[PDB]
Symmetry: C2
Subunit: 329 residues, 2 copies
Protein backbone atom coordinates (compact mmCIF):
# COMPACT_ATOMS: atom_id res chain seq x y z
CA UNK A 1 0.00 0.00 0.00
CA UNK A 2 2.59 2.56 -1.06
CA UNK A 3 0.17 4.45 -3.32
CA UNK A 4 -2.79 6.63 -2.30
CA UNK A 5 -5.74 8.13 -4.21
CA UNK A 6 -5.78 11.86 -4.87
CA UNK A 7 -8.28 13.92 -6.85
CA UNK A 8 -5.72 13.96 -9.69
CA UNK A 9 -5.18 10.22 -9.46
CA UNK A 10 -2.89 7.78 -7.60
CA UNK A 11 0.43 9.09 -6.30
CA UNK A 12 3.26 7.32 -4.50
CA UNK A 13 3.37 8.26 -0.82
CA UNK A 14 6.87 9.73 -1.16
CA UNK A 15 5.23 12.47 -3.26
CA UNK A 16 2.91 13.60 -0.43
CA UNK A 17 5.53 15.52 1.50
CA UNK A 18 4.36 18.04 4.09
CA UNK A 19 0.73 17.04 4.49
CA UNK A 20 -2.13 18.84 6.22
CA UNK A 21 -4.39 16.05 7.38
CA UNK A 22 -7.60 17.95 8.16
CA UNK A 23 -8.72 20.73 5.83
CA UNK A 24 -11.60 21.76 3.56
CA UNK A 25 -11.88 23.61 0.31
CA UNK A 26 -15.49 24.48 1.20
CA UNK A 27 -17.70 23.68 4.21
CA UNK A 28 -21.21 23.21 2.88
CA UNK A 29 -24.09 20.76 2.37
CA UNK A 30 -24.90 18.14 -0.27
CA UNK A 31 -26.00 19.80 -3.54
CA UNK A 32 -25.68 23.27 -2.08
CA UNK A 33 -22.66 24.57 -4.02
CA UNK A 34 -24.26 23.64 -7.34
CA UNK A 35 -27.74 24.87 -6.49
CA UNK A 36 -26.70 28.19 -4.98
CA UNK A 37 -23.11 29.14 -5.93
CA UNK A 38 -23.95 32.84 -5.51
CA UNK A 39 -23.99 32.13 -1.78
CA UNK A 40 -20.20 32.11 -2.19
CA UNK A 41 -20.18 35.06 -4.60
CA UNK A 42 -19.80 32.61 -7.44
CA UNK A 43 -18.36 29.19 -8.10
CA UNK A 44 -15.52 30.97 -9.87
CA UNK A 45 -14.80 33.38 -7.01
CA UNK A 46 -14.63 30.43 -4.59
CA UNK A 47 -12.32 28.41 -6.85
CA UNK A 48 -10.06 31.42 -7.29
CA UNK A 49 -9.85 31.97 -3.55
CA UNK A 50 -8.96 28.33 -2.94
CA UNK A 51 -6.22 28.40 -5.58
CA UNK A 52 -4.70 31.54 -4.09
CA UNK A 53 -4.79 30.09 -0.59
CA UNK A 54 -3.40 26.71 -1.58
CA UNK A 55 -0.68 28.40 -3.62
CA UNK A 56 0.45 30.44 -0.62
CA UNK A 57 0.39 27.29 1.51
CA UNK A 58 2.56 25.57 -1.09
CA UNK A 59 4.92 28.54 -0.99
CA UNK A 60 5.19 27.84 2.73
CA UNK A 61 6.00 24.17 2.18
CA UNK A 62 2.68 22.38 2.06
CA UNK A 63 2.60 19.70 -0.63
CA UNK A 64 -0.63 17.79 0.24
CA UNK A 65 -3.92 18.44 2.02
CA UNK A 66 -6.59 16.01 3.08
CA UNK A 67 -9.99 17.49 2.38
CA UNK A 68 -12.13 15.72 4.96
CA UNK A 69 -15.41 17.11 3.53
CA UNK A 70 -17.93 14.28 3.21
CA UNK A 71 -21.06 13.97 1.04
CA UNK A 72 -23.16 15.74 3.65
CA UNK A 73 -20.55 18.49 4.12
CA UNK A 74 -21.18 19.32 0.47
CA UNK A 75 -17.97 17.82 -0.90
CA UNK A 76 -17.71 18.70 -4.59
CA UNK A 77 -14.76 16.63 -5.84
CA UNK A 78 -14.86 18.28 -9.27
CA UNK A 79 -14.07 21.53 -7.45
CA UNK A 80 -11.27 19.85 -5.47
CA UNK A 81 -9.72 18.50 -8.67
CA UNK A 82 -9.88 21.87 -10.37
CA UNK A 83 -8.19 23.76 -7.54
CA UNK A 84 -5.69 20.95 -6.89
CA UNK A 85 -4.47 21.18 -10.47
CA UNK A 86 -4.36 25.01 -10.58
CA UNK A 87 -2.55 25.23 -7.27
CA UNK A 88 -0.50 22.07 -7.98
CA UNK A 89 -1.15 20.71 -4.48
CA UNK A 90 -2.21 17.13 -3.86
CA UNK A 91 -5.70 16.82 -2.38
CA UNK A 92 -6.89 13.61 -0.83
CA UNK A 93 -10.71 13.33 -0.87
CA UNK A 94 -12.95 11.67 1.71
CA UNK A 95 -15.92 9.39 1.92
CA UNK A 96 -17.87 8.85 5.16
CA UNK A 97 -20.59 10.93 6.80
CA UNK A 98 -20.47 14.05 8.98
CA UNK A 99 -23.14 15.46 11.33
CA UNK A 100 -25.79 16.38 8.73
CA UNK A 101 -26.92 13.21 6.96
CA UNK A 102 -30.12 13.65 4.93
CA UNK A 103 -33.03 11.17 5.19
CA UNK A 104 -31.76 9.10 2.31
CA UNK A 105 -28.60 8.51 4.40
CA UNK A 106 -30.17 8.48 7.93
CA UNK A 107 -32.47 5.58 7.06
CA UNK A 108 -29.78 3.25 5.72
CA UNK A 109 -28.41 0.07 7.32
CA UNK A 110 -24.83 -0.56 8.30
CA UNK A 111 -24.58 -2.84 5.26
CA UNK A 112 -25.84 -0.12 2.94
CA UNK A 113 -23.57 2.55 4.38
CA UNK A 114 -20.64 0.15 4.02
CA UNK A 115 -21.42 -0.30 0.33
CA UNK A 116 -21.62 3.48 -0.19
CA UNK A 117 -18.26 4.08 1.50
CA UNK A 118 -16.75 1.22 -0.50
CA UNK A 119 -18.18 2.72 -3.66
CA UNK A 120 -16.45 6.05 -3.15
CA UNK A 121 -13.10 4.36 -2.38
CA UNK A 122 -13.05 1.49 -4.87
CA UNK A 123 -15.14 2.86 -7.74
CA UNK A 124 -15.24 6.64 -7.51
CA UNK A 125 -17.18 9.60 -6.22
CA UNK A 126 -20.32 10.35 -8.23
CA UNK A 127 -19.40 9.98 -11.91
CA UNK A 128 -15.96 11.58 -11.70
CA UNK A 129 -13.89 8.42 -11.28
CA UNK A 130 -12.14 10.22 -8.43
CA UNK A 131 -11.49 7.94 -5.44
CA UNK A 132 -11.47 8.81 -1.74
CA UNK A 133 -8.26 8.11 0.15
CA UNK A 134 -9.77 8.43 3.62
CA UNK A 135 -13.03 7.89 5.55
CA UNK A 136 -14.33 10.77 7.69
CA UNK A 137 -16.86 10.24 10.49
CA UNK A 138 -18.33 12.47 13.19
CA UNK A 139 -20.17 11.89 16.45
CA UNK A 140 -21.77 13.86 19.22
CA UNK A 141 -20.08 13.17 22.57
CA UNK A 142 -22.63 10.41 23.12
CA UNK A 143 -22.66 8.40 19.87
CA UNK A 144 -26.20 8.14 18.44
CA UNK A 145 -27.50 4.87 17.05
CA UNK A 146 -27.10 6.12 13.48
CA UNK A 147 -23.61 7.46 14.18
CA UNK A 148 -22.64 4.10 15.60
CA UNK A 149 -23.79 2.53 12.31
CA UNK A 150 -21.62 5.02 10.45
CA UNK A 151 -18.59 4.15 12.62
CA UNK A 152 -19.12 0.42 12.08
CA UNK A 153 -19.52 0.99 8.34
CA UNK A 154 -16.32 3.07 8.29
CA UNK A 155 -14.43 0.32 10.11
CA UNK A 156 -15.60 -2.34 7.67
CA UNK A 157 -14.70 -0.18 4.66
CA UNK A 158 -11.31 0.48 6.23
CA UNK A 159 -10.68 -3.21 6.87
CA UNK A 160 -11.59 -4.09 3.28
CA UNK A 161 -9.50 -1.37 1.60
CA UNK A 162 -6.85 -0.40 4.12
CA UNK A 163 -7.67 3.31 3.86
CA UNK A 164 -7.67 5.18 7.19
CA UNK A 165 -10.47 6.67 9.28
CA UNK A 166 -10.48 10.18 10.72
CA UNK A 167 -13.03 11.51 13.18
CA UNK A 168 -14.73 14.65 14.40
CA UNK A 169 -15.05 14.68 18.18
CA UNK A 170 -16.40 16.86 20.92
CA UNK A 171 -13.05 16.83 22.72
CA UNK A 172 -14.49 18.56 25.81
CA UNK A 173 -16.73 15.49 26.21
CA UNK A 174 -13.86 13.06 25.50
CA UNK A 175 -15.68 11.79 22.41
CA UNK A 176 -12.80 9.65 21.17
CA UNK A 177 -13.11 7.05 23.88
CA UNK A 178 -16.57 5.96 22.72
CA UNK A 179 -15.44 6.04 19.09
CA UNK A 180 -12.38 3.92 19.80
CA UNK A 181 -14.52 1.33 21.64
CA UNK A 182 -16.82 0.92 18.63
CA UNK A 183 -13.87 0.80 16.21
CA UNK A 184 -12.06 -1.92 18.16
CA UNK A 185 -15.28 -3.96 18.46
CA UNK A 186 -15.08 -4.15 14.67
CA UNK A 187 -11.52 -5.50 14.77
CA UNK A 188 -10.15 -2.24 13.42
CA UNK A 189 -6.60 -1.27 14.28
CA UNK A 190 -6.13 1.99 16.20
CA UNK A 191 -3.22 2.76 13.84
CA UNK A 192 -5.82 3.25 11.07
CA UNK A 193 -7.68 5.87 13.09
CA UNK A 194 -7.16 9.56 13.79
CA UNK A 195 -9.27 10.98 16.62
CA UNK A 196 -9.70 14.56 15.43
CA UNK A 197 -10.29 18.02 16.93
CA UNK A 198 -8.34 16.72 19.91
CA UNK A 199 -6.75 20.14 20.45
CA UNK A 200 -10.22 21.29 21.58
CA UNK A 201 -9.40 20.14 25.13
CA UNK A 202 -6.48 20.47 27.54
CA UNK A 203 -7.08 17.12 29.19
CA UNK A 204 -3.74 15.43 28.53
CA UNK A 205 -4.75 12.26 30.41
CA UNK A 206 -7.42 11.68 27.79
CA UNK A 207 -5.02 12.36 24.90
CA UNK A 208 -2.06 10.29 26.09
CA UNK A 209 -4.31 7.32 26.88
CA UNK A 210 -5.63 7.28 23.33
CA UNK A 211 -2.14 7.74 21.90
CA UNK A 212 -0.85 4.97 24.16
CA UNK A 213 -3.35 2.66 22.48
CA UNK A 214 -1.94 3.47 19.06
CA UNK A 215 -4.52 6.05 17.94
CA UNK A 216 -3.44 8.96 15.80
CA UNK A 217 -4.23 12.21 17.59
CA UNK A 218 -5.52 15.08 15.48
CA UNK A 219 -4.51 18.49 16.75
CA UNK A 220 -6.11 20.07 13.80
CA UNK A 221 -7.71 23.39 14.71
CA UNK A 222 -4.65 25.31 15.93
CA UNK A 223 -5.57 28.71 14.43
CA UNK A 224 -9.18 28.60 15.65
CA UNK A 225 -9.66 31.22 18.39
CA UNK A 226 -12.30 33.86 19.19
CA UNK A 227 -10.08 35.66 21.67
CA UNK A 228 -10.81 39.36 21.23
CA UNK A 229 -14.16 38.46 19.72
CA UNK A 230 -15.95 37.44 22.90
CA UNK A 231 -18.95 39.63 22.10
CA UNK A 232 -19.53 37.59 18.93
CA UNK A 233 -21.43 34.61 20.32
CA UNK A 234 -21.22 32.58 17.09
CA UNK A 235 -17.47 33.13 16.87
CA UNK A 236 -16.99 31.95 20.48
CA UNK A 237 -19.32 29.00 19.93
CA UNK A 238 -17.46 27.88 16.82
CA UNK A 239 -13.78 28.52 17.56
CA UNK A 240 -13.70 28.64 21.36
CA UNK A 241 -11.63 31.19 23.26
CA UNK A 242 -8.44 29.28 23.99
CA UNK A 243 -5.43 30.89 22.28
CA UNK A 244 -3.72 29.28 19.30
CA UNK A 245 -0.58 28.99 21.41
CA UNK A 246 -2.60 27.03 23.99
CA UNK A 247 -3.63 24.64 21.25
CA UNK A 248 -0.11 24.38 19.87
CA UNK A 249 1.39 23.52 23.27
CA UNK A 250 -0.49 20.21 23.11
CA UNK A 251 1.82 19.23 20.25
CA UNK A 252 4.82 19.84 22.53
CA UNK A 253 2.99 18.20 25.42
CA UNK A 254 2.48 15.01 23.45
CA UNK A 255 6.04 15.01 22.07
CA UNK A 256 7.38 15.46 25.61
CA UNK A 257 5.38 12.38 26.70
CA UNK A 258 6.97 10.28 23.98
CA UNK A 259 4.08 10.25 21.50
CA UNK A 260 5.70 12.11 18.59
CA UNK A 261 4.64 9.32 16.20
CA UNK A 262 0.92 9.63 17.00
CA UNK A 263 0.55 13.36 16.30
CA UNK A 264 -1.18 14.83 13.23
CA UNK A 265 -1.34 18.59 12.82
CA UNK A 266 -3.66 20.76 10.73
CA UNK A 267 -5.63 24.04 10.46
CA UNK A 268 -9.16 22.80 9.80
CA UNK A 269 -9.36 25.76 7.40
CA UNK A 270 -11.61 26.41 4.39
CA UNK A 271 -12.15 28.98 1.61
CA UNK A 272 -15.92 29.11 1.91
CA UNK A 273 -18.46 27.96 4.47
CA UNK A 274 -22.26 27.77 4.16
CA UNK A 275 -22.76 25.39 7.09
CA UNK A 276 -22.54 28.17 9.67
CA UNK A 277 -23.74 31.77 10.10
CA UNK A 278 -23.59 34.14 7.12
CA UNK A 279 -20.28 35.96 6.48
CA UNK A 280 -18.48 33.70 8.93
CA UNK A 281 -15.69 33.08 6.42
CA UNK A 282 -14.79 36.75 6.88
CA UNK A 283 -14.65 36.38 10.67
CA UNK A 284 -12.30 33.42 10.34
CA UNK A 285 -10.05 35.18 7.81
CA UNK A 286 -10.01 38.21 10.15
CA UNK A 287 -8.52 35.97 12.84
CA UNK A 288 -6.20 33.90 10.68
CA UNK A 289 -5.05 35.76 7.54
CA UNK A 290 -2.45 33.02 6.99
CA UNK A 291 -5.21 30.51 6.28
CA UNK A 292 -3.79 27.04 5.64
CA UNK A 293 -0.25 28.48 5.81
CA UNK A 294 -0.75 28.99 9.55
CA UNK A 295 0.80 25.63 10.49
CA UNK A 296 4.07 26.05 8.51
CA UNK A 297 4.37 29.84 9.01
CA UNK A 298 3.32 30.27 12.66
CA UNK A 299 3.13 26.94 14.50
CA UNK A 300 6.34 25.33 13.24
CA UNK A 301 8.54 28.28 14.32
CA UNK A 302 6.72 28.41 17.66
CA UNK A 303 7.57 24.76 18.30
CA UNK A 304 11.19 25.27 17.24
CA UNK A 305 11.47 28.24 19.59
CA UNK A 306 10.22 25.94 22.38
CA UNK A 307 13.13 23.64 21.54
CA UNK A 308 11.52 20.85 19.51
CA UNK A 309 14.05 19.34 17.03
CA UNK A 310 13.57 19.88 13.29
CA UNK A 311 13.69 16.10 12.74
CA UNK A 312 10.75 15.80 15.14
CA UNK A 313 8.65 18.42 13.35
CA UNK A 314 9.50 16.79 10.06
CA UNK A 315 8.41 13.37 11.28
CA UNK A 316 5.10 14.87 12.40
CA UNK A 317 4.37 16.97 9.30
CA UNK A 318 5.71 14.40 6.81
CA UNK A 319 6.28 10.93 8.19
CA UNK A 320 3.17 10.51 10.33
CA UNK A 321 0.77 11.54 7.51
CA UNK A 322 2.43 9.15 5.06
CA UNK A 323 2.25 6.19 7.43
CA UNK A 324 -1.34 7.19 8.21
CA UNK A 325 -2.59 7.68 4.62
CA UNK A 326 -0.76 4.65 3.14
CA UNK A 327 -3.43 1.96 2.59
CA UNK A 328 -2.48 -0.67 5.16
CA UNK A 329 -4.13 -4.06 5.61
Amino acid sequence: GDRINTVRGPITISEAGFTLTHEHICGSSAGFLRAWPEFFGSRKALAEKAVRGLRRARAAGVRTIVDVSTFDLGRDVSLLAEVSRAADVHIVAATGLWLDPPLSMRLRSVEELTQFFLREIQYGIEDTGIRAGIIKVATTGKVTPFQELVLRAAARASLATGVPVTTHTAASQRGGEQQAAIFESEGLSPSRVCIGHSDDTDDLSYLTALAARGYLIGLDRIPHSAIGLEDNASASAFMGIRSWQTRALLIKALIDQGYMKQILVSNDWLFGISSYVTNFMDVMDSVNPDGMAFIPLRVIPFLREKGIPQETLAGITVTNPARFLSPTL
Copy 2:
Protein backbone atom coordinates in the same frame (compact mmCIF):
# COMPACT_ATOMS: atom_id res chain seq x y z
CA GLY B 1 -49.29 36.90 -18.48
CA ASP B 2 -49.47 33.45 -20.07
CA ARG B 3 -46.48 31.11 -20.18
CA ILE B 4 -45.64 28.28 -17.76
CA ASN B 5 -42.02 27.21 -17.38
CA THR B 6 -41.28 23.54 -17.92
CA VAL B 7 -38.06 21.54 -17.96
CA ARG B 8 -38.07 21.86 -21.78
CA GLY B 9 -38.90 25.58 -21.77
CA PRO B 10 -42.00 27.81 -21.71
CA ILE B 11 -45.36 26.43 -22.80
CA THR B 12 -48.70 28.16 -23.26
CA ILE B 13 -51.68 27.47 -21.05
CA SER B 14 -53.48 25.51 -23.81
CA GLU B 15 -50.44 23.22 -24.21
CA ALA B 16 -50.60 22.03 -20.58
CA GLY B 17 -53.80 19.98 -20.90
CA PHE B 18 -54.65 17.31 -18.36
CA THR B 19 -52.27 18.19 -15.53
CA LEU B 20 -51.34 16.26 -12.39
CA THR B 21 -50.38 19.00 -9.98
CA HIS B 22 -48.52 17.07 -7.26
CA GLU B 23 -46.10 14.35 -8.39
CA HIS B 24 -42.42 13.26 -8.23
CA ILE B 25 -40.03 11.60 -10.62
CA CYS B 26 -37.92 10.57 -7.62
CA GLY B 27 -38.17 11.22 -3.87
CA SER B 28 -34.63 11.48 -2.56
CA SER B 29 -32.18 13.89 -0.90
CA ALA B 30 -29.94 16.69 -2.22
CA GLY B 31 -26.89 15.19 -3.98
CA PHE B 32 -28.03 11.62 -3.34
CA LEU B 33 -28.99 10.44 -6.85
CA ARG B 34 -25.65 11.54 -8.27
CA ALA B 35 -23.52 10.24 -5.35
CA TRP B 36 -25.24 6.84 -5.09
CA PRO B 37 -27.28 6.00 -8.22
CA GLU B 38 -26.89 2.29 -7.52
CA PHE B 39 -29.37 2.67 -4.69
CA PHE B 40 -32.00 2.88 -7.45
CA GLY B 41 -30.27 0.05 -9.35
CA SER B 42 -28.80 2.62 -11.69
CA ARG B 43 -29.64 6.10 -13.01
CA LYS B 44 -30.36 4.54 -16.39
CA ALA B 45 -32.80 2.08 -14.82
CA LEU B 46 -34.61 4.79 -12.83
CA ALA B 47 -34.92 6.93 -15.96
CA GLU B 48 -36.25 4.04 -18.04
CA LYS B 49 -38.86 3.31 -15.37
CA ALA B 50 -39.97 6.94 -15.23
CA VAL B 51 -40.31 7.18 -19.01
CA ARG B 52 -42.50 4.05 -19.13
CA GLY B 53 -44.54 5.45 -16.24
CA LEU B 54 -44.94 8.82 -17.90
CA ARG B 55 -45.78 7.20 -21.24
CA ARG B 56 -48.50 5.16 -19.52
CA ALA B 57 -49.90 8.26 -17.80
CA ARG B 58 -49.81 9.97 -21.20
CA ALA B 59 -51.79 7.17 -22.84
CA ALA B 60 -54.32 7.69 -20.03
CA GLY B 61 -54.69 11.34 -21.04
CA VAL B 62 -52.09 13.10 -18.92
CA ARG B 63 -50.15 15.84 -20.73
CA THR B 64 -48.35 17.62 -17.88
CA ILE B 65 -47.12 16.78 -14.42
CA VAL B 66 -45.86 19.14 -11.76
CA ASP B 67 -42.84 17.62 -10.07
CA VAL B 68 -42.98 19.23 -6.62
CA SER B 69 -39.58 17.82 -5.60
CA THR B 70 -37.55 20.51 -3.91
CA PHE B 71 -33.83 20.91 -3.51
CA ASP B 72 -33.90 18.85 -0.29
CA LEU B 73 -36.07 16.15 -1.87
CA GLY B 74 -33.09 15.64 -4.19
CA ARG B 75 -34.74 17.11 -7.28
CA ASP B 76 -32.48 16.44 -10.28
CA VAL B 77 -33.85 18.65 -13.03
CA SER B 78 -31.49 17.14 -15.59
CA LEU B 79 -33.29 13.85 -14.96
CA LEU B 80 -36.71 15.50 -15.22
CA ALA B 81 -35.62 17.07 -18.53
CA GLU B 82 -34.39 13.75 -19.92
CA VAL B 83 -37.51 11.80 -19.00
CA SER B 84 -39.83 14.63 -20.09
CA ARG B 85 -38.27 14.68 -23.55
CA ALA B 86 -38.28 10.91 -23.93
CA ALA B 87 -41.89 10.50 -22.79
CA ASP B 88 -43.20 13.67 -24.43
CA VAL B 89 -44.89 14.81 -21.22
CA HIS B 90 -44.48 18.35 -19.89
CA ILE B 91 -42.84 18.57 -16.46
CA VAL B 92 -43.00 21.66 -14.28
CA ALA B 93 -40.09 21.83 -11.80
CA ALA B 94 -40.35 23.23 -8.27
CA THR B 95 -38.29 25.42 -5.94
CA GLY B 96 -38.94 25.77 -2.19
CA LEU B 97 -38.01 23.48 0.72
CA TRP B 98 -39.53 20.29 2.06
CA LEU B 99 -39.01 18.69 5.49
CA ASP B 100 -35.32 17.77 5.22
CA PRO B 101 -33.33 20.98 4.71
CA PRO B 102 -29.58 20.57 5.19
CA LEU B 103 -27.63 22.74 7.62
CA SER B 104 -26.69 25.20 4.86
CA MET B 105 -30.43 25.87 4.39
CA ARG B 106 -31.57 25.69 8.04
CA LEU B 107 -29.24 28.50 9.10
CA ARG B 108 -30.46 30.91 6.43
CA SER B 109 -32.62 34.00 6.99
CA VAL B 110 -35.97 34.69 5.36
CA GLU B 111 -34.15 37.17 3.10
CA GLU B 112 -31.64 34.55 1.98
CA LEU B 113 -34.29 31.90 1.40
CA THR B 114 -36.21 34.43 -0.70
CA GLN B 115 -33.07 34.96 -2.86
CA PHE B 116 -32.64 31.23 -3.32
CA PHE B 117 -36.28 30.65 -4.32
CA LEU B 118 -36.11 33.67 -6.63
CA ARG B 119 -32.96 32.48 -8.35
CA GLU B 120 -34.56 29.08 -9.12
CA ILE B 121 -37.60 30.84 -10.64
CA GLN B 122 -35.97 33.84 -12.31
CA TYR B 123 -32.52 32.56 -13.29
CA GLY B 124 -32.62 28.78 -13.31
CA ILE B 125 -31.90 25.64 -11.31
CA GLU B 126 -28.21 24.86 -10.82
CA ASP B 127 -26.46 25.52 -14.12
CA THR B 128 -29.23 24.07 -16.30
CA GLY B 129 -31.16 27.19 -17.29
CA ILE B 130 -34.34 25.34 -16.30
CA ARG B 131 -36.73 27.55 -14.34
CA ALA B 132 -39.12 26.46 -11.56
CA GLY B 133 -42.82 27.09 -12.23
CA ILE B 134 -43.97 26.33 -8.69
CA ILE B 135 -42.85 26.87 -5.07
CA LYS B 136 -43.32 23.87 -2.77
CA VAL B 137 -43.28 24.17 1.02
CA ALA B 138 -43.99 21.85 3.96
CA THR B 139 -44.94 22.12 7.62
CA THR B 140 -45.54 19.45 10.29
CA GLY B 141 -48.74 20.75 11.89
CA LYS B 142 -47.42 23.26 14.39
CA VAL B 143 -45.20 25.45 12.21
CA THR B 144 -41.58 25.43 13.39
CA PRO B 145 -39.67 28.74 13.39
CA PHE B 146 -37.62 27.66 10.37
CA GLN B 147 -40.74 26.50 8.54
CA GLU B 148 -42.36 29.88 9.09
CA LEU B 149 -39.30 31.47 7.44
CA VAL B 150 -39.70 29.13 4.46
CA LEU B 151 -43.37 29.99 4.13
CA ARG B 152 -42.73 33.74 4.22
CA ALA B 153 -39.89 33.45 1.70
CA ALA B 154 -42.21 31.36 -0.50
CA ALA B 155 -44.85 34.10 -0.30
CA ARG B 156 -42.30 36.78 -1.16
CA ALA B 157 -40.96 34.78 -4.13
CA SER B 158 -44.54 34.16 -5.30
CA LEU B 159 -45.41 37.84 -4.98
CA ALA B 160 -42.34 38.89 -6.98
CA THR B 161 -42.99 36.37 -9.78
CA GLY B 162 -46.64 35.32 -9.82
CA VAL B 163 -45.75 31.62 -9.63
CA PRO B 164 -48.03 29.72 -7.24
CA VAL B 165 -47.28 28.09 -3.87
CA THR B 166 -48.21 24.49 -3.04
CA THR B 167 -47.93 22.91 0.41
CA HIS B 168 -47.51 19.67 2.30
CA THR B 169 -49.56 19.58 5.49
CA ALA B 170 -50.33 17.25 8.33
CA ALA B 171 -54.03 17.35 7.41
CA SER B 172 -54.99 15.37 10.51
CA GLN B 173 -53.56 18.24 12.52
CA ARG B 174 -55.48 20.74 10.35
CA GLY B 175 -52.09 22.22 9.44
CA GLY B 176 -53.42 24.27 6.52
CA GLU B 177 -54.87 26.80 8.94
CA GLN B 178 -51.49 27.93 10.34
CA GLN B 179 -50.14 28.02 6.78
CA ALA B 180 -52.95 30.23 5.51
CA ALA B 181 -52.46 32.67 8.40
CA ILE B 182 -48.78 33.07 7.62
CA PHE B 183 -49.47 33.51 3.89
CA GLU B 184 -52.17 36.09 4.50
CA SER B 185 -49.98 38.05 6.90
CA GLU B 186 -47.58 38.38 3.94
CA GLY B 187 -50.24 39.66 1.58
CA LEU B 188 -50.43 36.50 -0.50
CA SER B 189 -53.71 35.87 -2.29
CA PRO B 190 -55.17 32.46 -1.36
CA SER B 191 -55.88 31.86 -5.06
CA ARG B 192 -52.09 31.56 -5.46
CA VAL B 193 -51.93 28.79 -2.87
CA CYS B 194 -52.71 25.08 -2.91
CA ILE B 195 -53.10 23.42 0.50
CA GLY B 196 -51.94 19.84 -0.17
CA HIS B 197 -52.39 16.33 1.25
CA SER B 198 -55.83 17.54 2.24
CA ASP B 199 -57.34 14.11 1.48
CA ASP B 200 -55.36 12.81 4.46
CA THR B 201 -58.39 13.82 6.58
CA ASP B 202 -62.15 13.30 6.57
CA ASP B 203 -62.79 16.67 8.27
CA LEU B 204 -64.79 18.36 5.51
CA SER B 205 -65.51 21.43 7.66
CA TYR B 206 -61.76 22.13 7.72
CA LEU B 207 -61.47 21.73 3.95
CA THR B 208 -64.61 23.70 3.09
CA ALA B 209 -63.61 26.59 5.37
CA LEU B 210 -60.27 26.86 3.55
CA ALA B 211 -61.94 26.58 0.14
CA ALA B 212 -64.35 29.33 1.20
CA ARG B 213 -61.35 31.59 1.86
CA GLY B 214 -60.17 31.14 -1.73
CA TYR B 215 -57.52 28.43 -1.23
CA LEU B 216 -56.98 25.64 -3.72
CA ILE B 217 -57.46 22.26 -2.05
CA GLY B 218 -54.94 19.62 -3.07
CA LEU B 219 -56.44 16.16 -2.92
CA ASP B 220 -53.25 14.54 -4.04
CA ARG B 221 -52.77 11.26 -2.17
CA ILE B 222 -55.79 9.28 -3.39
CA PRO B 223 -53.92 6.06 -4.19
CA HIS B 224 -52.06 6.14 -0.85
CA SER B 225 -53.86 3.32 0.94
CA ALA B 226 -52.36 0.53 3.05
CA ILE B 227 -55.64 -1.24 3.83
CA GLY B 228 -55.99 -4.89 4.81
CA LEU B 229 -52.67 -4.77 6.63
CA GLU B 230 -52.49 -3.67 10.26
CA ASP B 231 -48.94 -5.04 10.54
CA ASN B 232 -46.51 -2.93 8.49
CA ALA B 233 -44.46 -0.61 10.71
CA SER B 234 -43.68 1.50 7.63
CA ALA B 235 -46.50 1.27 5.09
CA SER B 236 -49.33 1.81 7.59
CA ALA B 237 -47.80 4.91 9.20
CA PHE B 238 -46.99 6.33 5.76
CA MET B 239 -50.11 5.57 3.70
CA GLY B 240 -52.87 5.28 6.32
CA ILE B 241 -55.89 2.97 6.58
CA ARG B 242 -58.62 4.82 4.67
CA SER B 243 -59.76 3.48 1.29
CA TRP B 244 -59.07 5.39 -1.91
CA GLN B 245 -62.79 5.60 -2.61
CA THR B 246 -63.14 7.43 0.71
CA ARG B 247 -60.42 9.87 -0.31
CA ALA B 248 -61.97 10.28 -3.76
CA LEU B 249 -65.47 10.98 -2.41
CA LEU B 250 -63.99 14.11 -0.84
CA ILE B 251 -63.69 15.41 -4.39
CA LYS B 252 -67.42 14.85 -4.75
CA ALA B 253 -68.14 16.48 -1.40
CA LEU B 254 -66.31 19.67 -2.39
CA ILE B 255 -67.91 19.79 -5.82
CA ASP B 256 -71.33 19.54 -4.16
CA GLN B 257 -70.46 22.51 -1.90
CA GLY B 258 -69.90 24.43 -5.12
CA TYR B 259 -66.11 24.53 -4.83
CA MET B 260 -65.17 22.66 -8.00
CA LYS B 261 -62.94 25.48 -9.25
CA GLN B 262 -60.73 25.20 -6.18
CA ILE B 263 -60.01 21.47 -6.37
CA LEU B 264 -56.72 20.03 -7.59
CA VAL B 265 -56.20 16.27 -7.85
CA SER B 266 -53.05 14.19 -8.12
CA ASN B 267 -51.38 10.86 -7.15
CA ASP B 268 -48.28 12.05 -5.26
CA TRP B 269 -46.58 9.14 -6.98
CA LEU B 270 -42.92 8.58 -7.89
CA PHE B 271 -40.65 6.15 -9.72
CA GLY B 272 -37.87 5.93 -7.15
CA ILE B 273 -37.70 6.71 -3.44
CA SER B 274 -34.70 6.79 -1.12
CA SER B 275 -36.07 9.00 1.64
CA TYR B 276 -37.88 6.15 3.38
CA VAL B 277 -37.17 2.49 4.14
CA THR B 278 -35.27 0.41 1.60
CA ASN B 279 -37.48 -1.07 -1.14
CA PHE B 280 -40.48 1.02 -0.15
CA MET B 281 -40.94 1.67 -3.88
CA ASP B 282 -41.88 -2.00 -4.28
CA VAL B 283 -44.47 -1.64 -1.49
CA MET B 284 -45.99 1.43 -3.19
CA ASP B 285 -46.03 -0.16 -6.65
CA SER B 286 -47.74 -3.27 -5.28
CA VAL B 287 -50.39 -1.06 -3.65
CA ASN B 288 -50.90 1.05 -6.79
CA PRO B 289 -49.81 -0.80 -9.98
CA ASP B 290 -51.36 2.03 -11.99
CA GLY B 291 -48.94 4.62 -10.57
CA MET B 292 -49.53 8.11 -11.99
CA ALA B 293 -52.29 6.71 -14.18
CA PHE B 294 -54.35 6.04 -11.03
CA ILE B 295 -56.14 9.42 -11.23
CA PRO B 296 -57.24 9.17 -14.86
CA LEU B 297 -57.83 5.38 -14.92
CA ARG B 298 -59.49 4.91 -11.53
CA VAL B 299 -60.58 8.17 -9.89
CA ILE B 300 -62.11 9.91 -12.92
CA PRO B 301 -64.38 6.97 -13.87
CA PHE B 302 -65.32 6.56 -10.20
CA LEU B 303 -66.48 10.16 -10.01
CA ARG B 304 -68.23 9.88 -13.37
CA GLU B 305 -70.21 6.90 -12.08
CA LYS B 306 -71.19 8.89 -9.00
CA GLY B 307 -72.84 11.41 -11.30
CA ILE B 308 -70.10 13.97 -11.84
CA PRO B 309 -70.42 15.35 -15.36
CA GLN B 310 -67.51 15.26 -17.81
CA GLU B 311 -67.26 19.06 -18.07
CA THR B 312 -66.74 19.20 -14.30
CA LEU B 313 -63.91 16.64 -14.39
CA ALA B 314 -62.38 18.61 -17.25
CA GLY B 315 -62.63 21.78 -15.21
CA ILE B 316 -60.71 20.09 -12.39
CA THR B 317 -58.00 18.27 -14.36
CA VAL B 318 -57.39 20.85 -17.07
CA THR B 319 -58.84 24.26 -16.25
CA ASN B 320 -58.00 24.51 -12.55
CA PRO B 321 -54.29 23.56 -13.02
CA ALA B 322 -53.87 26.02 -15.90
CA ARG B 323 -55.24 28.89 -13.83
CA PHE B 324 -53.21 27.84 -10.80
CA LEU B 325 -49.92 27.55 -12.69
CA SER B 326 -50.19 30.52 -15.06
CA PRO B 327 -48.11 33.20 -13.32
CA THR B 328 -50.46 35.90 -12.06
CA LEU B 329 -50.36 39.01 -9.86
